[PDB]
Amino acid sequence: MPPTRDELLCTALNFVGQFAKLDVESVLSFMSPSCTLRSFPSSLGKPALQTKEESKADFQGLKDFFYNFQLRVKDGAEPVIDEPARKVVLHIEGKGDSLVGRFETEYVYILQINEEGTMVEDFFQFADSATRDAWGKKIEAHFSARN
Amino acid sequence: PPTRDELLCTALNFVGQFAKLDVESVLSFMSPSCTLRSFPSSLGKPALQTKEESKADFQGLKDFFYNFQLRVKDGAEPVIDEPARKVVLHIEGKGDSLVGRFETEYVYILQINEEGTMVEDFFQFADSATRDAWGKKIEAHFSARN
């Protein structure tokens, strides 16, 4: 039996809740081995697509640079669920206290769940590049100063 | 209720109106109650605005672009919540503008009315990367200005 609307939302929001653990592996453990990570908007030289293996560095950085961090569905933003496709669309806010101060960003996640309803097999994110890139610059200036 | 493909056709036709750069063709496929929700917050736009307030930004679009095209980005399957009458699309926008060649992209989430004919909620999440005076991203620092 295919996942129900409720089962799809459960797996998607369990995936989203793993980011706050800042432990690298809890997020990765909700991605199937063949999971495609897609990261938008497109930018020159940046790959749109990543393997699960390639994305582990990203979760390593979350751990290393944040005292705390949480992803949450924006209040009032009802999930959009394509039950046939096993897809959950979420308007997400990420907020945390980092090495270089407060970080508050947002995203659209589109999560495709596997047939079993247990893992994310396609992880689309559309990032708020203004805040992401600004924080990235602060991280670079911080490490450049530590030397 | 509106069908999957029925919601899809209405959504894609709404996206198709933007190239007209005439302000009114887009508004005419929105409902009088239709709201426009613009994200991310970093771009400084209201999280909520009226159809009337939005006519200003469509007039901006007309004045900014000589030509403009909105398309579903290649290979981006639409995401359709049939009971909610919502269509999620990954959109690319390209055109010749006052400051030159300009390209951007969005996620649209379009809620269609019960008749399956017009847009009742227009959610967009735009590319917020900083651009230089000619609309180019930092990675394009050395490319020709087109």
Swiss-Prot record, chain B:
Domain of life: Eukaryota
Effect of inactivating the gene: Impairs the synthesis of austinol and dehydroaustinol and accumulates (5'R)-isoaustinone.
Misc. comment: In A.calidoustus, the austinoid gene cluster lies on a contiguous DNA region, while clusters from E.nidulans and P.brasilianum are split in their respective genomes. Genetic rearrangements provoked variability among the clusters and E.nidulans produces the least number of austionoid derivatives with the end products austinol and dehydroaustinol, while P.brasilianum can produce until acetoxydehydroaustin, and A.calidoustus produces the highest number of identified derivatives.
Protein name (Swiss-Prot/TrEMBL): Austinoid biosynthesis clusters protein H
Family classification: Belongs to the trt14 isomerase family.
TM region positions: none
Pathway(s): Secondary metabolite biosynthesis; terpenoid biosynthesis
Role of this protein: Part of the gene cluster B that mediates the biosynthesis of austinol and dehydroaustinol, two fungal meroterpenoids. The first step of the pathway is the synthesis of 3,5-dimethylorsellinic acid by the polyketide synthase ausA. 3,5-dimethylorsellinic acid is then prenylated by the polyprenyl transferase ausN. Further epoxidation by the FAD-dependent monooxygenase ausM and cyclization by the probable terpene cyclase ausL lead to the formation of protoaustinoid A.
GO BP field: austinol biosynthetic process; dehydroaustinol biosynthetic process; terpenoid biosynthetic process
Summary of subunit composition and partner proteins: Homodimer.
Lineage: Eukaryota, Fungi, Dikarya, Ascomycota, Pezizomycotina
UniProt organism field: Emericella nidulans (strain FGSC A4 / ATCC 38163 / CBS 112.46 / NRRL 194 / M139)
